[PDB]
Amino acid sequence: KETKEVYEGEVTELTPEDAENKTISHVIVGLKSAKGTKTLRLDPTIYESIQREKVSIGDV
Amino acid sequence: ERLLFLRSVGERNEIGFPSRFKSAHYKKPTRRHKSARQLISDENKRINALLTKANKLVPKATYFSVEAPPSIRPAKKYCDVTGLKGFYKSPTNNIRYHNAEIYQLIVKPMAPGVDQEYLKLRGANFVL
Amino acid sequence: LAGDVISIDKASGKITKLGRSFARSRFVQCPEGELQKRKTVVHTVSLHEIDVINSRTQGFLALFTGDTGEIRSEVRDQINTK
Amino acid sequence: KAVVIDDPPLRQTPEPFDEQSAYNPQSPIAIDFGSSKLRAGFVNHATPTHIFPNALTKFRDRKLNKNFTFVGNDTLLDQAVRSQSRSPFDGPFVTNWNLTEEILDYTFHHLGVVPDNGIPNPILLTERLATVQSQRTNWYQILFETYNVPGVTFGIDSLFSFYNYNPSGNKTGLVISCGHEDTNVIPVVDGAGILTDAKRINWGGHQAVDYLNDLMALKYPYFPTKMSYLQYETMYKDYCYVSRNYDEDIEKILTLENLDTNDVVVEAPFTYDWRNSILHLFLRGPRPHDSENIHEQHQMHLNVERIRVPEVIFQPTMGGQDQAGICELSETILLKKFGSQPGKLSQTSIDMVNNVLITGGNAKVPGLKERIVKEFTGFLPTGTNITVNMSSDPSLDAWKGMAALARNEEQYRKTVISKKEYEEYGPEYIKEHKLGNTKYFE
C-alpha cells in the first residue's frame, strides 16, 4: 500500500535560496492551477531535477 | 400645437439675471472654455515646476501616479475584424486576421485609408 | 532561404524543408491555404514494438538492429493490461 | 425558429417637474455630480429625491426671448430638444461653468430652498480621485463666492459606497468601481483608502458605448440609416454580458450550435455555402441572407461579438490603452503590497479579500461578479475565503454613502471645510480625512 501525492500546475515563482556554508540551500516554488496557488519548499535534488527539465517561470 | 406645451413647461423655471440663488456679491467671470486636454498638461507643468523648485520630494497621489502600469504578461492577440483569435497578421496593412476567408474577402480587398480605423480601435493608428 | 516550401511543427520545434518552390532563378508546388491546420495521423503500432519500448533495457533501435534479446514476460503482461 | 425584430428607440417622460416648497433650513443637501446621472436630495431621506441625466440645453425660440427648457428632465419631452442637449461633462472634468451654475440653480429650485444670503445649507459633494488642483480651486470659488455655502466636503464616490455598505468606518476592504467614464480599484485599510496604492483604468462605460459604435460601424460600412448614440446605449445595456472564461468562448462563439441561443438581431427603424462561410455567420448569423428584403438591409445584426464589449475592462489593450486590467491590479494589490508576498498573505490582505465591493453605473452588466470571483480564486491561495459584495442598483449607492456620512455627526465634523478655513488657508487646501482625497505630497 502506498500514497501518490502530485503537485500540478504553472510555476509562478522560482526562487532558490543559497545559504552557503555556490551550493543552494533550498528552492521556493509557487505552483498555480485554476483552483488557486500553492507554495512549496524543495531540496536541491528536486531543484537539480527541475533544472534538468529546463523549467522556467510560466511552465506547467 | 405641441410648441405651446413646450413654452408651458418652460414657463415655470425662468431664472432672472439677478438670480435668487445668489450671494448678493456674485460676479460671474469670463473664464475661457477650457477643454479636457490642456488641463492634464498644465497640471504636469505645475508638478515639474514644483519638483524642480523643491529638489534644488516624492509625490504621494497625483493624476499620474494613480495611472495603472502596463501589464507584464503578453497580451492576447485577436482578429481585427471578427474578434476571434488572430493567428496571422497581414504583412502589407498590418491587420491581424482569423483565417483564409476573412483574408481574401476583407483584408486583401481593403482600400487604403480603411486600415487606420481598424488599428485605431486597437490603439495602433500610426498615422498622426 | 526565400522560395522554400517548408513545414513547421510548433510544439516539437521540427522544421522540414519540403523543397524549393516554382522559382525559375527539388521543385515542389506551393501548398494550399489555411495555414496552421489540424492534421489527423493514424498510427498502427505492433504489440512487439510496444513490448520493446516498455522494456526499459531495450531501446527502439532493437526494432531495427534486432537485438531485443528475450523480452521478459511481465513487460508483456503490463502491455496487455495497458 | 421565427426571426424577431428589435426596435431600439427610447420613450419620452411626460412629467418632468416635481418639487416641494417645505424644507428644512438647517438640513444639508446631498448632491452627486455624476458624469452620467446627477443625483440630488436631502439628508433625512434614504433615497435620492431627484435623478437627472446631468445635461442641459439652450433652446432658441422666436418671439419669446430665445431662452426656454434649460436644465434637466425637460429635455426628455421632445426628441428635438434632446438631440442637441449638451451634457457639459468631458472625460475627466465638466467644461463650462455657467452651465454648471444653471444645473445647481435648477436643482436648488427643485428642493424648494428659499434664499438666505446665498444658500443656508451645507453641501455634500462627490469628487473624482486625484483631482486637478485647478478644479478644486474653481470648485471652492463656485461654492464659496457664488452660493455662500457654509459647509463643503467632498470625496471619492467609491469610498462613499464602501462607507455605505460598511457603516462602521474602520473596516478593511477593496472597492472596484466602474463609472461612466472611469474605472478604478482602491484598497481601504481601517476605513482609510490608501489612495497611494489605488489604480485607474480610463475606460468606464462611455468608452464601451463608443467601442460598440466603432465596432458596429466598422462591421457595416454601408448601413442605410444613422444609428443614434442613445440607441447605442440602449442596445448595449441589454445584450452585453461578461463571459466566465473569455479564451474558450471566442473559439465557440461562432459555431453553428451556439448561434441559436446567443444571437439576437436588432432592427433599425425606417419609414460557397453559407454554413461553411464563417463570414456569413459573423455578419448575418445563423439565418440565410435575403439581400432583397428591406428589413435585412436595416437588420442590425449584433450579438456575434456581444462578449467583446464588456471584456475590455479586463484586457484594456483591446481598447487601445496600454494598462493592466483590473484583474492584474487586484493581483498586485492583494499579493505585492501591504506586507504581502506571492505565496503568503498578510492579515490586511486576507481582510481585503474577505470584503470585496463592486459598484458604479457600469457594474450592472451581467456576469461581472462571477467572472471577478473566478479570476480572484485563480491567483489567490487555496482555502482563502472570497466574498464579493453587490448592490441591487450600484449606481446610486454613493448617494446613500453621503447620506450615511450625514447621519454620523462626529464623522461629519472631521471632514467639514468651512468658509473661514478656506479664507485663512486659501483655495489650495485638502482635509486629509480618510473618506476622500489626500495631499499630492507629504
XYZ file of C-alpha atoms in Angstrom:
712
model
C 0.000 0.000 0.000
C 1.390 3.391 -0.991
C 0.466 7.047 -1.371
C 0.594 9.131 -4.544
C 0.809 12.886 -3.956
C 1.071 15.145 -7.000
C 1.694 18.882 -7.355
C 0.479 20.035 -10.784
C 0.465 23.500 -12.256
C 2.202 26.572 -13.606
C 5.345 27.903 -11.930
C 4.692 31.451 -10.714
C 7.840 31.953 -8.613
C 11.116 30.002 -8.672
C 13.436 31.460 -6.037
C 16.487 29.403 -4.996
C 17.932 30.272 -1.582
C 21.675 29.618 -1.492
C 22.854 29.965 2.163
C 26.421 28.826 1.556
C 28.466 27.018 4.202
C 27.755 28.073 -4.719
C 25.540 25.416 -3.128
C 21.823 26.149 -2.801
C 20.029 25.589 0.494
C 16.550 25.110 -0.975
C 14.148 26.440 -3.595
C 10.752 28.104 -3.115
C 8.415 27.093 -5.956
C 4.957 28.555 -6.461
C 2.565 26.373 -8.445
C -0.805 27.601 -9.664
C -3.896 25.948 -11.146
C -7.454 27.117 -11.823
C -8.490 26.388 -8.219
C -5.688 28.523 -6.777
C -1.987 28.573 -5.977
C 0.280 26.743 -3.539
C 3.871 27.295 -2.399
C 6.413 24.524 -1.796
C 9.894 24.244 -0.306
C 12.080 21.806 -2.238
C 15.508 20.290 -1.601
C 18.374 20.843 -4.100
C 17.872 17.340 -5.554
C 14.418 18.332 -6.809
C 15.953 21.656 -7.904
C 18.512 19.633 -9.883
C 15.663 17.662 -11.473
C 13.785 20.918 -12.185
C 16.791 22.476 -13.928
C 17.194 19.170 -15.784
C 13.754 19.699 -17.346
C 14.604 23.309 -18.408
C 11.813 24.653 -16.211
C 11.381 28.435 -16.289
C 8.735 30.843 -15.000
C 5.365 30.148 -16.593
C 5.680 26.406 -17.255
C 3.034 23.939 -16.119
C -49.656 72.717 -31.486
C -47.121 70.975 -29.254
C -44.979 74.125 -29.256
C -47.211 75.845 -26.695
C -46.913 72.771 -24.451
C -43.141 73.336 -24.633
C -43.489 77.010 -23.703
C -45.949 75.998 -20.959
C -43.464 73.666 -19.273
C -40.713 76.204 -19.904
C -42.792 78.983 -18.281
C -42.034 77.599 -14.803
C -38.221 77.629 -14.481
C -37.111 81.116 -15.546
C -34.129 82.331 -13.548
C -33.635 86.069 -13.834
C -30.347 87.809 -14.483
C -30.340 88.689 -10.759
C -30.582 85.067 -9.672
C -32.430 84.282 -6.463
C -29.736 81.738 -5.512
C -27.013 84.372 -5.452
C -24.675 85.532 -2.704
C -25.502 89.243 -3.460
C -21.857 89.896 -4.376
C -21.689 87.251 -7.116
C -19.760 88.453 -10.187
C -19.809 85.751 -12.941
C -16.349 85.686 -14.665
C -15.434 85.410 -18.401
C -13.244 82.314 -17.876
C -12.448 80.605 -21.162
C -13.983 77.358 -22.412
C -11.154 75.155 -21.187
C -11.007 71.709 -22.775
C -10.047 68.430 -21.105
C -6.732 68.166 -22.986
C -4.513 71.008 -21.761
C -5.566 70.679 -18.106
C -3.559 67.455 -17.750
C -0.517 69.085 -19.349
C -0.555 72.267 -17.271
C -1.003 70.181 -14.133
C 2.064 68.341 -15.440
C 3.822 71.710 -15.881
C 2.869 72.618 -12.294
C 4.270 69.298 -10.990
C 7.598 69.711 -12.824
C 7.805 73.335 -11.626
C 7.207 72.183 -8.039
C 9.712 69.316 -8.197
C 12.446 71.413 -9.835
C 11.903 74.184 -7.287
C 11.911 71.622 -4.450
C 14.831 69.357 -5.410
C 17.281 72.268 -5.748
C 10.178 65.339 -2.946
C 8.373 62.128 -3.910
C 4.718 62.714 -4.903
C 2.039 60.957 -2.875
C -1.089 60.746 -5.061
C -1.336 62.797 -8.264
C -3.231 62.222 -11.503
C -0.149 60.476 -12.944
C 0.834 58.211 -10.037
C -2.771 56.949 -9.898
C -2.356 55.677 -13.502
C -2.204 51.905 -13.826
C 1.091 50.448 -15.106
C 1.151 48.436 -18.342
C 0.704 44.693 -17.997
C 3.681 42.367 -17.610
C 2.100 39.266 -19.186
C 1.804 39.141 -23.002
C -1.475 40.484 -24.333
C -3.756 38.123 -26.231
C -3.785 38.768 -29.978
C -7.214 38.961 -31.599
C -8.597 39.203 -35.113
C -9.064 42.846 -36.061
C -12.425 42.402 -37.833
C -14.121 39.259 -36.472
C -12.802 39.467 -32.905
C -11.725 35.807 -32.813
C -8.170 34.518 -32.323
C -5.722 36.296 -34.587
C -3.448 33.532 -35.817
C -1.958 35.570 -38.667
C -1.102 39.196 -39.413
C -1.127 40.519 -42.969
C 2.320 41.923 -43.888
C 1.003 44.767 -46.052
C -1.525 46.684 -43.940
C -0.633 45.096 -40.532
C -4.161 43.749 -39.920
C -4.376 40.623 -37.765
C -6.963 38.275 -39.290
C -8.533 34.941 -38.394
C -8.253 32.572 -41.378
C -8.182 32.433 -45.182
C -11.732 33.578 -45.974
C -11.501 36.800 -43.936
C -8.093 37.484 -45.517
C -9.385 37.036 -49.075
C -12.723 38.821 -48.601
C -11.814 41.661 -46.189
C -8.069 42.151 -45.696
C -6.929 41.696 -49.313
C -9.652 43.912 -50.956
C -9.293 46.516 -48.193
C -8.958 50.008 -49.643
C -6.251 52.433 -48.493
C -7.433 54.548 -45.582
C -9.558 51.767 -44.064
C -6.698 50.119 -42.119
C -6.348 53.221 -39.913
C -9.721 52.721 -38.194
C -9.002 49.029 -37.543
C -5.650 49.928 -35.998
C -7.230 52.855 -34.112
C -9.720 50.529 -32.411
C -6.697 48.604 -31.112
C -4.805 51.843 -30.462
C -2.191 51.271 -33.179
C -3.175 54.127 -35.520
C 0.299 55.147 -36.687
C -0.985 57.967 -38.926
C -0.953 61.250 -36.999
C 16.067 30.809 -47.794
C 13.418 32.692 -49.744
C 11.431 30.432 -52.051
C 11.342 27.304 -49.866
C 8.174 25.356 -49.114
C 8.639 24.105 -45.543
C 6.559 22.575 -42.763
C 6.774 23.549 -39.089
C 5.521 21.606 -36.086
C 5.079 24.246 -33.400
C 5.112 22.060 -30.282
C 8.053 19.809 -31.195
C 10.003 22.581 -32.948
C 10.783 20.499 -36.041
C 11.215 22.216 -39.414
C 11.141 20.025 -42.525
C 12.198 21.530 -45.855
C 9.689 20.125 -48.337
C 11.672 21.787 -51.104
C 12.151 24.711 -53.479
C 9.014 26.330 -54.878
C 8.327 27.325 -58.503
C 11.101 29.903 -58.797
C 12.985 29.679 -62.082
C 16.149 31.552 -60.925
C 13.920 19.849 -55.586
C 10.865 21.581 -57.049
C 7.515 21.313 -55.251
C 4.324 23.291 -55.869
C 3.123 25.958 -53.451
C 0.762 24.403 -50.874
C -2.913 25.204 -50.468
C -4.140 27.804 -47.995
C -5.398 27.731 -44.386
C -2.063 27.670 -42.579
C -1.880 26.139 -39.076
C -4.151 23.228 -39.924
C -5.186 20.257 -37.821
C -3.820 17.027 -39.289
C -5.164 13.648 -38.193
C -2.453 10.976 -38.098
C -3.455 7.322 -37.715
C -0.684 5.175 -36.230
C -0.694 1.373 -36.316
C 1.962 0.125 -33.885
C 2.513 -3.603 -33.444
C 2.495 -5.136 -29.963
C 6.121 -6.235 -30.390
C 7.147 -2.582 -30.795
C 5.366 -1.608 -27.570
C 6.990 -4.612 -25.855
C 10.419 -3.399 -26.996
C 9.605 0.184 -25.936
C 8.243 -0.732 -22.491
C 11.255 -2.949 -21.785
C 13.419 -0.228 -20.241
C 16.647 -2.105 -21.025
C 15.665 -2.177 -24.726
C 15.601 0.892 -26.911
C 13.627 1.043 -30.126
C 16.880 0.664 -32.095
C 16.480 -3.043 -31.297
C 13.422 -2.805 -33.558
C 15.958 -2.202 -36.357
C 19.150 -3.844 -35.081
C 17.206 -6.906 -33.932
C 18.985 -7.453 -30.600
C 15.874 -7.382 -28.429
C 17.232 -10.366 -26.512
C 14.477 -12.342 -24.733
C 11.958 -9.737 -23.591
C 10.605 -10.645 -20.160
C 7.044 -11.879 -19.739
C 5.986 -9.287 -17.136
C 6.549 -6.455 -19.640
C 4.160 -8.259 -21.996
C 1.560 -8.585 -19.213
C 1.788 -4.832 -18.500
C 1.435 -4.165 -22.239
C -1.626 -6.444 -22.457
C -3.296 -4.757 -19.466
C -2.500 -1.280 -20.835
C -37.417 29.444 -35.282
C -39.085 32.655 -36.444
C -36.666 35.585 -36.554
C -37.864 38.521 -34.472
C -37.035 42.227 -34.764
C -35.891 44.677 -32.086
C -36.747 48.361 -32.382
C -34.420 50.374 -30.099
C -35.988 53.873 -29.561
C -36.462 55.098 -26.002
C -39.728 56.645 -24.800
C -40.311 60.192 -23.550
C -41.162 61.096 -19.954
C -44.341 63.235 -19.754
C -43.962 64.504 -16.142
C -40.580 66.240 -15.766
C -41.117 68.578 -12.820
C -41.779 67.768 -9.163
C -40.684 69.785 -6.131
C -41.883 70.707 -2.646
C -41.751 74.173 -1.091
C -41.491 72.913 2.500
C -37.877 72.308 3.503
C -35.523 72.341 6.483
C -33.185 75.383 6.575
C -30.598 73.522 8.700
C -30.524 70.115 6.985
C -27.661 69.835 4.451
C -28.066 68.962 0.777
C -26.549 65.805 -0.728
C -25.794 66.009 -4.459
C -23.815 63.520 -6.552
C -22.282 65.234 -9.594
C -22.042 62.116 -11.706
C -20.772 62.095 -15.268
C -23.877 60.224 -16.452
C -26.550 60.882 -13.799
C -26.916 63.851 -11.480
C -28.334 62.782 -8.118
C -29.919 65.204 -5.671
C -31.701 65.117 -2.356
C -31.858 65.966 1.320
C -30.137 64.311 4.292
C -33.063 62.758 6.191
C -34.298 60.829 3.138
C -32.744 57.420 2.495
C -33.254 57.554 -1.304
C -32.210 60.470 -3.551
C -35.138 62.695 -4.462
C -34.035 63.804 -7.947
C -32.388 61.698 -10.662
C -31.307 63.622 -13.760
C -29.197 62.873 -16.860
C -26.782 65.743 -15.923
C -27.490 67.505 -19.223
C -28.874 70.897 -20.204
C -29.697 72.771 -23.394
C -30.235 76.335 -24.610
C -33.387 76.226 -26.720
C -33.743 79.105 -29.185
C -37.405 80.103 -29.514
C -38.575 83.015 -31.644
C -40.788 85.821 -30.167
C -40.312 84.538 -26.560
C -36.770 85.856 -25.812
C -34.939 82.672 -27.003
C -34.403 81.114 -23.548
C -36.532 78.092 -22.610
C -36.382 74.478 -21.249
C -32.872 74.914 -19.895
C -31.902 72.245 -17.362
C -32.910 68.706 -16.520
C -35.623 66.229 -17.491
C -37.379 68.957 -19.529
C -35.166 67.878 -22.453
C -36.939 64.488 -22.346
C -40.281 65.837 -23.615
C -39.197 66.021 -27.266
C -36.520 64.328 -29.345
C -35.647 67.655 -30.997
C -34.683 69.275 -27.683
C -32.919 66.075 -26.553
C -30.844 65.983 -29.760
C -28.614 68.996 -29.026
C -28.894 68.708 -25.213
C -25.251 69.160 -24.256
C -24.053 67.391 -21.155
C -21.147 69.696 -20.214
C -19.040 66.852 -18.818
C -15.897 65.978 -20.770
C -13.729 62.959 -19.930
C -12.216 63.919 -16.571
C -13.866 67.256 -15.876
C -17.034 69.200 -16.703
C -16.246 72.059 -19.083
C -18.457 75.161 -18.828
C -19.122 76.995 -15.571
C -22.307 78.924 -16.365
C -23.826 75.593 -17.416
C -22.958 74.038 -14.034
C -24.320 77.150 -12.316
C -27.558 76.525 -14.218
C -27.566 72.857 -13.078
C -27.065 73.937 -9.458
C -29.680 76.710 -9.712
C -32.238 74.305 -11.219
C -31.690 71.621 -8.590
C -31.739 74.227 -5.783
C -35.090 75.320 -7.193
C -36.149 71.661 -7.095
C -35.705 71.245 -3.328
C -37.748 74.389 -2.690
C -34.896 76.033 -0.777
C -35.641 79.704 -0.128
C -32.857 82.296 -0.345
C -30.982 83.159 2.831
C -27.924 85.126 1.665
C -26.590 82.670 -0.931
C -27.558 79.218 0.390
C -28.390 78.489 4.065
C -27.470 74.808 3.817
C -24.188 72.892 3.850
C -23.404 70.999 0.665
C -22.218 67.407 0.216
C -20.173 66.962 -2.967
C -18.653 63.957 -4.733
C -15.145 64.429 -6.120
C -13.167 62.254 -8.512
C -9.935 60.590 -7.429
C -6.651 62.513 -7.910
C -8.470 65.726 -8.782
C -6.666 68.515 -10.645
C -5.890 71.412 -8.293
C -7.429 73.977 -10.660
C -10.714 72.046 -10.483
C -10.751 72.116 -6.687
C -9.880 75.839 -6.560
C -12.669 76.654 -9.010
C -14.983 74.343 -7.036
C -14.080 76.350 -3.922
C -14.920 79.515 -5.865
C -18.269 78.238 -7.193
C -19.339 77.177 -3.716
C -17.997 79.977 -1.509
C -18.061 83.177 -3.587
C -21.063 82.032 -5.654
C -23.518 80.233 -3.355
C -22.187 81.154 0.157
C -22.409 77.545 1.356
C -21.149 77.335 4.971
C -20.057 73.703 4.797
C -18.318 71.931 1.917
C -16.776 68.471 1.839
C -16.155 66.018 -0.986
C -14.737 62.559 -1.531
C -14.471 59.605 -3.874
C -17.884 58.115 -4.654
C -16.475 54.577 -4.492
C -15.230 55.332 -0.973
C -18.713 56.699 -0.247
C -20.255 53.411 -1.427
C -17.768 51.473 0.718
C -18.762 53.601 3.718
C -22.422 52.969 2.849
C -22.097 49.191 2.841
C -19.663 49.326 5.799
C -21.084 51.987 8.150
C -18.608 51.166 10.944
C -15.985 53.402 9.330
C -12.994 51.239 10.312
C -13.368 48.179 8.070
C -10.818 46.767 5.628
C -11.749 46.058 2.037
C -11.188 46.552 -1.673
C -13.558 48.626 -3.811
C -13.657 48.213 -7.598
C -15.768 50.962 -9.155
C -16.708 51.224 -12.832
C -18.255 54.611 -13.573
C -19.476 56.221 -16.763
C -16.068 57.446 -17.954
C -13.610 55.931 -15.457
C -12.965 52.722 -13.537
C -10.687 52.351 -10.529
C -9.559 49.915 -7.843
C -8.998 51.395 -4.375
C -7.809 49.459 -1.296
C -9.226 50.602 2.047
C -7.415 49.743 5.305
C -9.159 50.600 8.629
C -11.760 52.629 6.676
C -8.950 54.727 5.137
C -8.492 54.437 1.351
C -4.757 54.012 0.654
C -5.015 56.206 -2.478
C -1.200 55.863 -2.673
C -1.860 52.290 -3.932
C -5.159 52.894 -5.774
C -5.074 52.451 -9.589
C -7.178 53.696 -12.514
C -8.361 52.456 -15.919
C -9.604 55.124 -18.330
C -12.464 53.149 -19.857
C -15.692 53.490 -17.862
C -18.942 52.880 -19.697
C -18.950 55.805 -22.132
C -15.962 54.344 -23.976
C -17.746 50.967 -24.007
C -20.641 52.513 -25.946
C -18.131 54.309 -28.185
C -16.393 50.953 -28.742
C -19.719 49.335 -29.668
C -20.407 52.225 -32.073
C -16.976 51.861 -33.696
C -17.265 48.056 -33.914
C -20.719 48.012 -35.391
C -19.904 50.805 -37.851
C -16.717 49.044 -38.997
C -18.721 45.829 -39.360
C -21.320 47.546 -41.586
C -19.789 50.413 -43.603
C -22.901 50.609 -45.832
C -25.656 50.877 -43.240
C -28.640 52.845 -44.640
C -29.752 54.815 -41.570
C -27.637 56.587 -38.978
C -27.687 54.664 -35.697
C -28.251 57.042 -32.785
C -25.856 57.131 -29.840
C -28.681 56.900 -27.286
C -29.841 53.739 -29.049
C -26.234 52.513 -28.823
C -26.512 52.832 -25.020
C -29.942 51.161 -25.197
C -28.789 48.040 -27.017
C -25.516 47.991 -25.067
C -27.303 47.875 -21.690
C -29.478 44.979 -22.962
C -27.390 42.436 -24.931
C -23.885 42.680 -23.376
C -22.612 40.330 -20.636
C -19.247 39.159 -19.316
C -18.170 35.602 -20.072
C -16.888 33.273 -17.368
C -13.798 32.489 -19.464
C -13.107 34.701 -22.468
C -10.425 32.492 -24.037
C -12.572 29.383 -24.524
C -15.661 31.372 -25.537
C -14.426 33.157 -28.676
C -13.469 29.856 -30.321
C -17.049 28.712 -29.612
C -18.912 31.987 -30.204
C -19.267 31.474 -33.986
C -20.116 27.770 -34.135
C -23.434 26.682 -35.620
C -24.967 25.261 -32.431
C -24.016 28.335 -30.370
C -25.662 30.855 -32.725
C -29.195 29.607 -31.966
C -29.352 30.994 -28.414
C -26.550 33.579 -28.322
C -27.578 35.656 -31.339
C -30.209 38.380 -31.031
C -30.880 40.567 -34.078
C -31.655 44.282 -33.754
C -33.714 46.173 -36.344
C -33.124 49.794 -37.300
C -36.285 51.901 -37.733
C -37.366 53.188 -41.132
C -40.460 54.524 -42.897
C -19.653 28.943 -51.364
C -22.113 27.525 -48.842
C -23.250 29.915 -46.119
C -22.828 27.287 -43.385
C -19.111 26.774 -44.049
C -18.669 30.531 -44.576
C -17.878 31.942 -41.131
C -18.050 35.476 -42.532
C -21.732 34.796 -43.223
C -22.054 33.527 -39.644
C -20.340 36.661 -38.321
C -22.250 39.149 -40.481
C -25.666 37.528 -40.969
C -25.906 34.979 -38.150
C -27.461 31.508 -38.320
C -30.010 32.516 -40.960
C -29.546 32.762 -44.746
C -29.219 36.294 -46.073
C -32.071 37.850 -48.067
C -30.356 40.786 -49.766
C -33.571 41.952 -51.474
C -35.517 42.382 -48.221
C -35.680 45.915 -46.838
C -35.585 44.510 -43.290
C -32.236 42.742 -43.776
C -30.645 45.958 -45.045
C -31.753 47.567 -41.767
C -31.151 44.435 -39.651
C -28.536 45.494 -37.114
C -27.078 42.004 -36.631
C -25.333 42.277 -33.266
C -24.659 39.603 -30.523
C -21.999 37.757 -32.532
C -19.428 39.780 -30.539
C -21.506 40.874 -27.551
C -18.787 39.358 -25.336
C -16.069 41.654 -26.723
C -17.503 44.948 -25.394
C -17.636 44.199 -21.600
C -14.466 42.063 -21.631
C -12.223 45.068 -22.386
C -12.261 46.229 -18.744
C -10.208 43.085 -18.043
C -7.996 43.484 -21.147
C -7.615 47.243 -21.784
C -5.188 46.583 -24.669
C -8.229 45.749 -26.810
C -9.440 49.295 -26.111
C -6.173 50.952 -27.091
C -4.858 51.816 -23.612
C -1.616 50.140 -22.516
C -2.765 49.435 -18.971
C -3.003 46.262 -16.932
C -6.570 45.147 -16.317
C -8.415 45.233 -13.002
C -7.520 41.559 -12.517
C -3.796 42.362 -12.610
C -4.265 45.484 -10.471
C -6.172 43.453 -7.870
C -3.450 40.783 -8.069
C -0.692 43.335 -7.417
C -2.657 44.954 -4.570
C -3.518 41.669 -2.846
C -0.167 39.929 -3.452
C 2.580 42.588 -3.533
C 1.504 45.456 -1.241
C 0.710 45.909 2.475
C 3.386 43.456 3.585
C 2.021 40.630 1.423
C 4.204 38.425 -0.782
C 3.374 35.909 -3.525
C 2.682 32.764 -1.522
C 1.666 34.069 1.910
C -0.923 36.742 2.660
C -0.846 39.412 5.336
C -3.870 39.846 7.599
C -4.856 43.096 5.859
C -4.800 41.275 2.504
C -6.986 38.472 3.909
C -9.470 41.005 5.316
C -9.446 42.814 1.959
C -10.159 39.551 0.125
C -12.966 38.778 2.599
C -14.642 42.149 1.804
C -14.725 42.997 -1.915
C -17.263 45.555 -3.148
C -18.063 46.390 -6.771
C -20.139 49.457 -7.595
C -20.837 52.070 -10.243
C -23.225 52.535 -13.126
C -21.282 50.135 -15.357
C -21.464 47.350 -12.757
C -24.978 46.242 -13.771
C -23.608 44.283 -16.756
C -24.475 40.612 -16.057
C -21.750 38.076 -15.368
C -19.370 40.567 -13.739
C -19.407 39.159 -10.191
C -18.922 35.514 -11.207
C -16.043 36.455 -13.527
C -14.489 38.572 -10.755
C -14.698 35.808 -8.141
C -13.447 33.113 -10.566
C -10.487 35.263 -11.588
C -9.864 36.074 -7.911
C -9.749 32.399 -6.938
C -7.478 31.821 -9.942
C -4.446 33.513 -8.377
C -5.277 33.536 -4.652
C -4.036 30.678 -2.435
C -6.390 27.758 -1.903
C -8.632 27.989 1.144
C -8.791 31.797 1.161
C -12.427 32.829 1.559
C -13.508 35.326 -1.110
C -16.666 37.405 -0.667
C -17.723 39.784 -3.450
C -20.423 42.279 -2.480
C -23.009 43.704 -4.870
C -25.915 46.135 -4.717
C -29.408 45.913 -6.155
C -28.609 49.148 -8.020
C -24.917 50.083 -7.699
C -25.217 53.470 -9.435
C -26.939 55.463 -6.668
C -25.426 53.762 -3.595
C -22.807 56.531 -3.362
C -25.674 58.921 -2.541
C -26.529 56.558 0.305
C -22.834 56.913 1.140
C -23.011 60.645 1.751
C -26.388 60.080 3.441
C -24.724 57.667 5.889
C -21.886 60.148 6.393
C -24.569 62.776 7.076
C -26.303 60.648 9.727
C -22.999 60.215 11.581
C -22.343 63.503 13.378
C -18.761 63.096 14.604
C -17.670 61.665 11.237
C -19.347 64.609 9.517
C -17.481 67.208 11.559
C -13.988 65.820 10.882
C -14.263 66.479 7.143
C -16.021 69.877 7.072
C -14.173 72.599 5.158
C -15.688 75.908 6.257
C -15.682 79.369 4.702
C -13.335 80.708 7.394
C -10.815 77.876 6.921
C -10.920 78.478 3.159
C -10.367 82.203 3.711
C -7.368 81.769 6.013
C -5.848 78.842 4.081
C -6.627 79.956 0.525
C -8.106 77.698 -2.158
C -5.112 75.317 -2.095
C -6.241 73.160 0.879
C -7.235 69.471 1.285
C -8.649 67.962 4.520
C -6.771 64.624 4.548
C -9.774 62.835 6.017
C -9.998 59.132 5.255
C -13.181 59.307 3.135
C -11.757 61.380 0.304
C -8.691 62.737 -1.445
C -5.243 63.265 0.070
C -2.315 65.625 -0.404
C -0.178 65.413 -3.533
C 2.946 65.232 -1.342
C 3.937 64.533 2.269
